[PDB]
Write a protein that binds this ligand. Structure first.
Ligand SMILES: [Zn+2]
Ligand SMILES: [Zn+2]
Length: 174
């Protein structure tokens, strides 16, 4: 019988819906619900498991656990990858870098200080900035065309780095 070490429940009869992660050292599985992990962090881990190298309680050596540090780090590197891509675009930067962060520079300062703890927080901050700009940059034709280009560029960057994340469903899009 294969049991989750954190609830002691056998998972042999667990249905497909049971979200779990595998320990890379002993191949045993652990329920996401039994671990200190949010839905987001579970998906980040599951999208690229080898980057975190999760280890169960029986195989974990140090505290805090190495996998936890690795996963936290991964989140930060991923957020930075998205912001860097946006800032490296002249047009996007022109429109959004310089005007709760109110511009991309504000997001950069908040991020560099390691203040972002979730993808949704980071995403919403940026969606709000983009939508605010779209709502206020006027009606010049080139501006109208750029508005859609910028929104799409952001969505593409988020889908590349966080494919499991619903950026299109942000409550802050109008
Ligand atoms: Zn469990
Ligand atoms: Zn293990």
């Amino acid at each position: 019988g294969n049991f989750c070490p954190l609830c002691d429940k056998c998972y042999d009869d667990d249905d497909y819906e049971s979200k779990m992660m595998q320990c890379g050292k002993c191949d045993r599985w652990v329920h996401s619900k039994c671990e200190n992990l949010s839905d987001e962090m579970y998906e980040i881990l599951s999208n690229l498991p080898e980057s975190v190298a999760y280890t169960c309680v029986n195989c974990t050596e140090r505290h805090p656990a190495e996998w936890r540090l690795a996963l936290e780090k991964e989140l930060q590197i991923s957020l930075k990858q998205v912001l860097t891509a946006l800032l490296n675009s002249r047009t996007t930067s022109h429109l959004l870098r310089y005007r709760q962060p109110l511009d991309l520079e504000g997001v950069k300062r908040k991020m560099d200080q390691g203040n972002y703890t979730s993808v949704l927080e980071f995403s919403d901050d940026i969606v709000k900035i983009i939508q605010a700009a779209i709502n206020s940059d006027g009606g010049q034709p080139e501006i109208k065309k750029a508005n859609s280009m910028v929104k799409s560029f952001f969505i593409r960057q988020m889908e590349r780095v966080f494919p499991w994340f619903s950026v299109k469903k942000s409550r802050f899009w109008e």
